[PDB]
């Protein structure tokens, strides 16, 4: 009575992993030739945001199993490694350093911080050396026991000059999926992290993503839309971290207020590196500001969201972070050539029951990006002063009776992107279908 009738082009999918590629908003850069993020050799985005809504259909997501995280976290390491390759290797830099302090008569926090130093650097000739005076930081040199100092890297890694024409500004990146695939979108406000979004829609290619590297906080990111939103995986576990998204930003100012000087020395036949030569004016601490009353009002929204499903009749105690590396302890971020380390003990000294603010900031030169013992990038110094202004969007916490300790955590860079990929998943389109009908 009924025979099998085939159907082609049926709107049905499954869930699958696939390769996925760049999409840039086409601009006229032509200045730093290419940045770290290869915006050049990327396809220009269609300026038609075709965003097709899906009616009366639901789908449970999981922000904790997005393979899009693992694809992109592979790529960010790899692009970083790819651009870092063709520049100068500072192999002969690892020498014995005669050093002393730079401003020996100083009372401030910057006392004993910058260190004048001395070399015997190999020139471009084979049998000619050179005594070189330079400046370094506390967080770059190690004593040996004008006591002899030595850099950090030589314990573990090697050194690459960081190509002093490229930039580091995080370009917004779109991700177009290939044909025969689609990217779902949740669009549900107050989404849990794992649940059936009713208001789904889909696109070919996601919105802008700025791949910024940050610890303890989420600079420059995407806002929320309704309120403070809490996400985590196992709220009853102490191993899972805490994802916080804020409905409003905080304008952070940050600066490195020193008028500097960069010198250059040919050390090989073409190898000429740049170093922190001299400081004009006099030595000033680098710091960051924040509106205190705005931030308390911001933090007052947080604890209300906390006490909803956790610790109603229980005090909420914030503590400073525990310890370990600086990347897992303090706020760390690049801001266009400099790698800041701002102490954040003055933001987690607070409890609850039932006129600005200044953070001191350190900077380094030798960076171990993504915990890869074996690689160490030497950033070049920057002339002039730095005037970084940024928003804030997120917060990374962890939980340590009727007492609760929330310490600020971080470490994994992949948690930065789950804050940007929870709205999406990858589906494989299936244009087949077989039904019984009345025809033979």
């Amino acid at each position: 009575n009924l025979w099998v009738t085939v159907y082609y082009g049926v709107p049905v999918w499954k869930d699958a992993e696939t390769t996925l590629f760049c999409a840039s908003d086409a601009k006229a850069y032509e200045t730093e030739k290419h940045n770290v993020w290869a915006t050049h050799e990327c396809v220009p985005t269609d300026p038609n945001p075709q965003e097709i809504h899906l009616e009366n259909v639901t789908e449970e997501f999981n922000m904790w199993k997005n393979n899009m995280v693992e694809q992109m976290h592979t790529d960010i390491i790899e692009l970083w490694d790819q651009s870092l390759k063709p520049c100068v290797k500072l192999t002969p830099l690892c020498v014995t350093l005669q050093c002393t302090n730079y401003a020996p008569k100083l009372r401030s926090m910057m006392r004993g911080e910058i260190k004048n130093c001395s070399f015997n650097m190999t020139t471009e000739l084979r049998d000619k050396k050179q005594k070189v005076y330079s400046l370094f930081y506390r967080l770059d040199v190690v004593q040996i026991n004008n006591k002899e100092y030595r850099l950090i890297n030589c314990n573990t890694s090697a050194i690459t000059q960081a190509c002093p024409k490229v930039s580091f500004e995080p370009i917004p990146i779109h991700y177009c999926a290939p044909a025969g695939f689609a990217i779902l979108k949740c669009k549900d406000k107050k989404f849990n992290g794992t649940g059936p979004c009713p208001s789904v829609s889909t696109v070919q290619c996601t919105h802008g993503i700025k791949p910024v590297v940050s610890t303890q906080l989420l600079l420059n990111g995407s806002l929320a839309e309704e309120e403070v939103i809490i996400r985590s995986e196992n709220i009853t576990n102490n191993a899972k971290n805490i994802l916080v998204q804020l409905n409003t930003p905080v304008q952070i100012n940050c600066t490195r207020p020193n008028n500097n000087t960069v010198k250059s020395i040919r050390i090989g036949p073409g190898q000429a590196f740049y170093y922190f030569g001299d400081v004009l004016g006099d030595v000033r601490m680098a710091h960051c500001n924040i509106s205190k009353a705005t931030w308390n009002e911001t933090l007052g929204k947080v604890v209300k969201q906390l006490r909803k499903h956790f610790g109603n009749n229980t005090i909420i105690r914030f503590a400073q972070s525990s310890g370990g590396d600086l990347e897992v302890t303090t706020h760390s971020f690049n801001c266009g050539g400099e790698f800041f380390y701002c102490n954040t003990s003055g933001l987690f000294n607070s409890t609850w029951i039932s006129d600005s603010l200044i953070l001191p900031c350190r900077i380094k030169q030798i960076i171990n990006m993504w915990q890869r013992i074996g690689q160490a990038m030497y950033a070049p110094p920057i002339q002039g002063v730095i005037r970084c202004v940024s928003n804030i969007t997120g917060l990374i916490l962890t939980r340590d009776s009727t007492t609760e300790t929330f310490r600020p955590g971080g470490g994994d860079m992949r948690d930065n992107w789950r804050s940007e990929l929870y709205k999406y998943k990858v589906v494989k389109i299936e244009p087949l279908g077989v039904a019984p009908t009345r025809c033979k």
């Binding site: 085939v6 709107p11 049905v12 044909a179």
Partner: protein
């Protein structure tokens, strides 16, 4: 509606949207090799065979060209005999599809055997 516009709709209502489903399939000449050029090369490849492997299957199933065509193999009613006049324009494609999913492998080999083996001989048998 649009591409995947009738996703949670009636199968008869979503019967008349197949062209938009098929147009929105499959650039930059002179690629380099570095990082993104690998993925764009991979983007070109995966669009081909995922377009093509089922395009083989319609020639396997004799339903060459875009046709909502029907076969000559009867529907086995052991495969969830549920009101096939009624339910055919009630639920969705989607939720109905995973119901079929336990037996689709059994169907397909019979599809390439029913009219594709037998009824593709017999026109040669009358070709005299």
């Amino acid at each position: 509606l649009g591409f995947l516009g009738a996703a949670g709709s009636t199968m008869g209502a979503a019967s008349m949207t197949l062209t938009v489903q098929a147009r929105n399939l499959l650039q930059q000449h002179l690629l380099k090799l570095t990082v993104w050029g690998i993925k764009q090369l991979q983007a070109r490849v995966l669009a081909v065979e995922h377009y093509l492997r089922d395009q083989q299957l319609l020639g396997i199933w004799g339903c060459s060209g875009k046709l909502i065509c029907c076969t000559n193999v009867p529907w086995n009613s052991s495969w969830s005999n549920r009101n096939l006049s009624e339910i055919w324009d009630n639920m969705t494609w989607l939720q109905w599809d995973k119901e079929i999913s336990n037996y689709t492998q059994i169907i397909y080999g019979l599809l390439e055997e029913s009219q594709n083996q037998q009824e593709k001989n017999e026109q040669d048998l009358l070709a005299l």
